[PDB]
Amino acid sequence: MKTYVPKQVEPRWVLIDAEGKTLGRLATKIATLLRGKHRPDWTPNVAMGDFVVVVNADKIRVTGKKLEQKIYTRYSGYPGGLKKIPLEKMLATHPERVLEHAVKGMLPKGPLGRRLFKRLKVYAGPDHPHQAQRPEKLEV
Amino acid sequence: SRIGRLPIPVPKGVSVEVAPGRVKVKGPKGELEVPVSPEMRVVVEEGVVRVERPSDERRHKSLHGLTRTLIANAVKGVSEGYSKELLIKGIGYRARLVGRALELTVGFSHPVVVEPPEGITFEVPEPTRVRVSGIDKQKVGQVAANIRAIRKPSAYHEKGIYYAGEPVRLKPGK
Amino acid sequence: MKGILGVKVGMTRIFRDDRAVPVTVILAGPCPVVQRRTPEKDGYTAVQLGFLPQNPKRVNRPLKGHFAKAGVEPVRILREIRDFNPEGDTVTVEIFKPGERVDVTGTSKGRGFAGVMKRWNFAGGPDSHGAHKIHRHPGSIGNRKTPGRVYKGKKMAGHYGAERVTVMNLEVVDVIPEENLLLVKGAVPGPNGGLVIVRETKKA
Amino acid sequence: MKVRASVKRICDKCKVIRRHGRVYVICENPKHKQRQG
RNA sequence: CGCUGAAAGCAUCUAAGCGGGAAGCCCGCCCCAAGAUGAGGCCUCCCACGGCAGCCGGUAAGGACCCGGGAAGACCA
RNA sequence: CGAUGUCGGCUCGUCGCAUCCUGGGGCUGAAGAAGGUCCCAAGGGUUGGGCUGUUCGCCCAUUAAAGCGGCACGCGAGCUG
Ligand SMILES: [Mg+2]
Ligand SMILES: [Mg+2]
Ligand SMILES: [Mg+2]
Ligand SMILES: [Mg+2]
Ligand SMILES: [Mg+2]
Ligand SMILES: [Mg+2]
Ligand SMILES: [Mg+2]
Ligand SMILES: [Mg+2]
Ligand SMILES: [Mg+2]
Ligand SMILES: [Mg+2]
Ligand SMILES: [Mg+2]
Ligand SMILES: [Mg+2]
Ligand SMILES: [Mg+2]
Ligand SMILES: [Mg+2]
Ligand SMILES: [Mg+2]
Ligand SMILES: [Mg+2]
Ligand SMILES: [Mg+2]
Ligand SMILES: [Mg+2]
Ligand SMILES: [Mg+2]
Ligand SMILES: [Mg+2]
Ligand SMILES: [Mg+2]
Ligand SMILES: [Mg+2]
Ligand SMILES: [Mg+2]
Ligand SMILES: [Mg+2]
Ligand SMILES: [Mg+2]
Ligand SMILES: [Mg+2]
Ligand SMILES: [Mg+2]
Ligand SMILES: [Mg+2]
Ligand SMILES: [Mg+2]
Ligand SMILES: [Mg+2]
Ligand SMILES: [Mg+2]
Ligand SMILES: [Mg+2]
Ligand SMILES: [Mg+2]
Ligand SMILES: [Mg+2]
Ligand SMILES: [Mg+2]
Ligand SMILES: [Mg+2]
Ligand SMILES: [Mg+2]
Ligand SMILES: [Mg+2]
Ligand SMILES: [Mg+2]
Ligand SMILES: [Mg+2]
Ligand SMILES: [Mg+2]
Ligand SMILES: [Mg+2]
Ligand SMILES: [Mg+2]
Ligand SMILES: [Mg+2]
Ligand SMILES: [Mg+2]
Ligand SMILES: [Mg+2]
Ligand SMILES: [Mg+2]
Ligand SMILES: [Mg+2]
Ligand SMILES: [Mg+2]
Ligand SMILES: [Mg+2]
Ligand SMILES: [Mg+2]
Ligand SMILES: [Mg+2]
Ligand SMILES: [Mg+2]
Ligand SMILES: [Mg+2]
Ligand SMILES: [Mg+2]
Ligand SMILES: [Mg+2]
Ligand SMILES: [Mg+2]
Ligand SMILES: [Mg+2]
Ligand SMILES: [Mg+2]
Ligand SMILES: [Mg+2]
Ligand SMILES: [Mg+2]
Ligand SMILES: [Mg+2]
Ligand SMILES: [Mg+2]
Ligand SMILES: [Mg+2]
Ligand SMILES: [Mg+2]
Ligand SMILES: [Mg+2]
Ligand SMILES: [Mg+2]
Ligand SMILES: [Mg+2]
Ligand SMILES: [Mg+2]
Ligand SMILES: [Mg+2]
Ligand SMILES: [Mg+2]
Ligand SMILES: [Mg+2]
Ligand SMILES: [Mg+2]
Ligand SMILES: [Mg+2]
Ligand SMILES: [Mg+2]
Ligand SMILES: [Mg+2]
Ligand SMILES: [Mg+2]
Ligand SMILES: [Mg+2]
Ligand SMILES: [Mg+2]
Ligand SMILES: [Mg+2]
Ligand SMILES: [Mg+2]
Ligand SMILES: [Zn+2]
């Protein structure tokens, strides 16, 4: 007997409210959903996890003094091109990127991992534009 | 040996209503909202407000005295109000009231007009005394600190803007 | 913000209060409003100006449909002025008065492939004392094994000019509405006959 | 302000305080101000 | 450097909270920039053509080729 | 060691900050002006000559200042020699 390999499946669209949840502990669950490891037919070499919609991403929570002391960093390739953005400022300017970054770092590197990241749709504020997909509300 | 335990006399007629995280104090001179830690409990009694803490841990012991004083400062502010007095010293130095604003001539090449924030009143009884008054104790002391900072007391001469009661301490020169 | 499209016509000097004032002459208007950008429709505010009438027998259909929806004759250039909403339907030199300061944008003259000395004002090499075929060369471009590479943005030979350049805070010396003429004190990018944009200065 | 690794009371008017993660010595005598560093 | 302020009846810029404060930091100015594959937006133009998410051919709006040139340019653009 | 060209200069930079200048400060045996000392700060700036191969240093005339270090004592498939 060979191990079961699934034929392609309709993905499950899912909706998660970010308000009040801790940044890192929410991200690990989203990553699990994107990989589809909650699914009994999980297969490592095809994209078969959920599509994850997240709202209220600007209301994510964080412990200690991370609002001031967590620094995001970007290197432009130029001399002096290291930019340091504190978490506070990122929330004030591109708040959806806090969760996106946290999740992306928890997905595998490579073509499949980049594909899985596109299946995550993060929104600040309580609304998302994906009624047509009828996302299933999740409590995590 | 405790400010938090000390009950707060409430003069009639001042009303102290409690809400989660805040205490609202209304009196003859205005209202003040006091933000209060949700770990503390503020209790209304007959002509008395009291604050209680839920343990003997350092943080609760620290918030206990703070919360009592802030509530008491609000009770005083709406009934008595607060004021601070500034003495201007030095030959040419003087103040006057331009409208309800304060104009200081204190040795610069120009005057210094200070606009009153909401809830602050300026008075100039004599040209060398300035009164700052309002219901908010923290604000009164802040505006007063700002006006003193225009021209601080000199290290060598009785010249500058002084708190009333501030001791004049000088250094010799030559 | 207010602006107008123009043509650089030439340079001369005038006499003002017994002073010779170098000027660039610019033929600016008249500029029809061809489209307006609104926050509801486009997400920002600007006016699309037209300039220089064109032979309709040179204007293809999608452009013609664009003009006609505006009730505008066929024009040679369309450019937008950001954050400008003129009341009329035609922008002319009269939006500027003498004494105002303006920013002027044009396409600078094209040096083509330019050496390090012309493009970056490098010092080049000695012309005697043994200098060997490096009189106009850049010298070293780096270090050694650390970092073993050349920085991004390293100044090197290459194309230079024929690029957008803004010169800021130029005094308007005169306005001649009869001939749609703006006189601006000083130098303005590009050749005579080049397209320019004149805007109210951003320098306070 | 004296910035040193050994911050100590210099006179009996000196008060050792901890302020925003640092040790300071404040005193009515300005020479006695210290910050650990 | 302060305001207000406990723990610590006083005091304390701090433990709750608020203010002031550098040529430096973020933005503002200028230039590039949607291969930003996350490939964005707006205006306008053509139209659902024949024959066996495919192929084949004729077209549309458009474009390219070629030619006269250009303060554009090594060729290219 | 079946080769990793070695001083100094020129050219071209870029970085560190234990900061020479400029900006912000506390203390002064800080009257003022000018200094001294320490703290914050690397954004920019940091001259031209005489001597000597010199690096350095001394000297001349200035300067807000004429900083110190790293990059194979940066840089010879870039030049000099
Ligand atoms: Mg789960
Ligand atoms: Mg595996
Ligand atoms: Mg956290
Ligand atoms: Mg955003
Ligand atoms: Mg990863
Ligand atoms: Mg790996
Ligand atoms: Mg009562
Ligand atoms: Mg009780
Ligand atoms: Mg002296
Ligand atoms: Mg142009
Ligand atoms: Mg050329
Ligand atoms: Mg050259
Ligand atoms: Mg040159
Ligand atoms: Mg040049
Ligand atoms: Mg030279
Ligand atoms: Mg020479
Ligand atoms: Mg030369
Ligand atoms: Mg030779
Ligand atoms: Mg030779
Ligand atoms: Mg030669
Ligand atoms: Mg070279
Ligand atoms: Mg390397
Ligand atoms: Mg070009
Ligand atoms: Mg004139
Ligand atoms: Mg020309
Ligand atoms: Mg002692
Ligand atoms: Mg004391
Ligand atoms: Mg004090
Ligand atoms: Mg106090
Ligand atoms: Mg005590
Ligand atoms: Mg605090
Ligand atoms: Mg503040
Ligand atoms: Mg502050
Ligand atoms: Mg102040
Ligand atoms: Mg400046
Ligand atoms: Mg552009
Ligand atoms: Mg695109
Ligand atoms: Mg674009
Ligand atoms: Mg990307
Ligand atoms: Mg597009
Ligand atoms: Mg055709
Ligand atoms: Mg040609
Ligand atoms: Mg060819
Ligand atoms: Mg060897
Ligand atoms: Mg060999
Ligand atoms: Mg070998
Ligand atoms: Mg060899
Ligand atoms: Mg260096
Ligand atoms: Mg330092
Ligand atoms: Mg220095
Ligand atoms: Mg200074
Ligand atoms: Mg003296
Ligand atoms: Mg002095
Ligand atoms: Mg000093
Ligand atoms: Mg210090
Ligand atoms: Mg110090
Ligand atoms: Mg610097
Ligand atoms: Mg730098
Ligand atoms: Mg430097
Ligand atoms: Mg010298
Ligand atoms: Mg000589
Ligand atoms: Mg000689
Ligand atoms: Mg010499
Ligand atoms: Mg020498
Ligand atoms: Mg020597
Ligand atoms: Mg000697
Ligand atoms: Mg001098
Ligand atoms: Mg100086
Ligand atoms: Mg070195
Ligand atoms: Mg060595
Ligand atoms: Mg050696
Ligand atoms: Mg070397
Ligand atoms: Mg050296
Ligand atoms: Mg070398
Ligand atoms: Mg050689
Ligand atoms: Mg050499
Ligand atoms: Mg080499
Ligand atoms: Mg070599
Ligand atoms: Mg080489
Ligand atoms: Mg020799
Ligand atoms: Mg020889
Ligand atoms: Zn002391």
Instruction: Tell me the three-class secondary structure of B78-104, residue by residue.
Output: HHCCEEEEEEEECCCCEEEEECCEEEE
CA C189 to chain A, closest CA, distance in angstroms equals 29
- C106 in Cβ contact with C6 (< 8 Å): no
**Secondary structure of residue C97 in the 3-state scheme:** coil
Residues from chain A contacting residue C151 (CB–CB below 8 Å): 78-79
**Method used to determine the 3D structure:** X-ray
Q: Which one-letter amino acid corresponds to residue A34?
A: L
Interface test with C, best of A75, A78, A82 (most C CBs within 10 A): A78
Could you tell me if C139 and C131 are in contact, meaning their C-beta atoms sit under 8 angstroms apart? no
On whether any CB of chain A is under 8 Å from the CB of C62, the answer is: no
* B163 strand-pairing partners: B86
Give the single-character DSSP code of B36: -
Chains sharing 3 or more CB pairs under 8 A with chain D: none
SS3 A33: helix
Residues of chain A with a CB closer than 8 angstroms to some CB in chain C: 76-79, 81
Instruction: Dump strand ranges (E) for chain C.
Output: 3-15, 20-27, 31-37, 46-53, 75-82, 90-91, 101-107, 113-114, 158-159, 164-176, 181-185, 195-200
Nearest CA in chain C to A77: C152
Q: Classify strands B48-52 and B8-9 as parallel, antiparallel or unpaired.
A: antiparallel
Torsion, Cα of C173, C177, C179, C183 (10° steps): 10
DSSP state for residue C147 in the 8-state scheme:
B
Amino acid at site A63: T
Report d(CA A30, CA A53) in Å as an integer. 10
Please give the structure tokens belonging to residue A130. 């994906």
Nearest C-alpha neighbor of A57 from the set A91, A32, A105, A107:
A91
**D11 annotated among ligand-binding-site residues:** yes
Q: Are the CB atoms for B36 and B23 separated by under 8 Å?
A: yes
Determine the Cα–Cα distance for residues B60 and B120; give it in Å rounded to an integer. Answer: 33
Gap from B73 CA to E9 C1', Å: 17
Q: Which nucleotide is nearest to B2 (CA to C1')?
A: E9
Query: What is the distance between the alpha carbons of residues A30 and A51, in angstroms, rounded to a whole number?
Result: 10
D15 touches strand F (CB under 7 A): no
Closest CA to B42 of B56, B52, B27: B52
At which residue do the structure tokens 């007997």 appear? Answer: A1
Residues facing residue C198 across a β-bridge = C4, C104
Q: How far is the CA of D17 from the centre of ligand 55 (A)?
A: 15
Q: Which backbone phi and psi does B79 adopt, to 5 degrees?
A: -100, -60
CA distance D16 to D37: 15
C1' of nucleotide F70: residue with nearest CA: C146
Q: Give the phi and the psi of residue B141 in degrees, each rounded to 5.
A: -65, -30
Rounded CA gap, A57 and A90, in Å?
12
Question: How far is it, in rounded angstroms, from Cα B52 to Cα B34?
Answer: 16
Task: Confirm if C61 and C55 have CB atoms less than 8 A apart.
Answer: no
Residue A75's alpha-carbon distances to A98, B22, C143, D11, in angstroms, are: 18, 46, 21, 52
What is the rounded distance in angstroms from the CA atom of residue A40 to the CA atom of residue C183?
A: 77
Ligand 9 centre to CA of A49 (Å) is 79
Please classify residue C189 by burial: count the beta carbons closer than 10 Å to its beta carbon, then call 0-12 exposed, 13-18 middle and 19+ buried. Answer: buried
Is C151 near chain A, with CB under 8 Å?
Answer: yes
Q: Rounded to the nearest 5°, which phi and psi values hold at C104?
A: -125, 130
Q: State the first-to-last Cα distance of chain A, in angstroms, to the nearest integer.
A: 36
- CA nearest C6: which of C28, C37, C35, C39? C28
- Taking CA atoms, D34 is separated from A43, B169, B171, C71, in Å, by 64, 22, 21, 77
Per the CB < 8 A criterion, the answer to whether A138 and A14 are in contact is yes
Within 10 A of A30 (CB to CB), how many other CB atoms are there?
26
Residue from C141, C143, C151 to probe the interface with A (highest A Cβ count within 10 Å): C151
Cβ of residue C147 closer than 8 Å to a chain A Cβ? no
What's phi and psi for A27, nearest 5 deg? -65, -35
Q: How far is the CA of C173 from the centre of ligand 24 (A)?
A: 6
- Name residue A21's amino acid: K
Instruction: Give the count of alpha carbons within 13 A of B4, CB side only.
Output: 20
**C1’ F34 / CA B124, Å:** 40
Is residue C191 a contact partner of residue C108, using CB atoms and an 8 Å limit? no
C83 — phi, psi (to 5°)?
60, 35
- DSSP percent split of chain C into helix, strand, coil, nearest 5: 10, 40, 50
Q: What is the C-alpha separation between B10 and B72, in angstroms, rounded?
A: 8
CA B43 – CA B4 distance, rounded (Å): 12
Question: What are the helix (H) ranges across A22-119?
Answer: 23-35, 66-69, 87-93, 96-104, 111-118
Other C-beta atoms within 10 Å of C172: how many? Answer: 22
Structure tokens at C180: 């749609």
Q: Which residues contact C184 (CB under 8 A, 6 or more apart)?
A: C23, C24, C26, C102, C104, C170, C171, C172, C173, C198
Strands A51-55 and A13-17: parallel
HSE-CB of A46 using CA atoms within 13 angstroms: 11
Chains that contact C by 3+ CB pairs under 8 Å? A
Peptide bond into C30 cis (omega under 30): yes
The rounded radius of gyration (Å) of the Cα atoms in chain C is 22
Euclidean distance between CA atoms C91 and B22, whole angstroms: 58
Q: What is the nearest CA distance from C152 to chain A, expressed in angstroms?
A: 5
Q: Is D30 annotated as contributing to ligand binding?
A: no
For residue B115, the CA-to-ligand 10 centroid distance in Å is: 49
Distance (Å, rounded) from C-alpha C100 to C-alpha A74?
Answer: 42
| Cα B149 off chain centre by | 16
Residue B33 to residue B25: CA distance in whole angstroms: 6
Chain C neighbors of A80, CB-CB under 8 A: none
D20 is in an annotated binding site: no
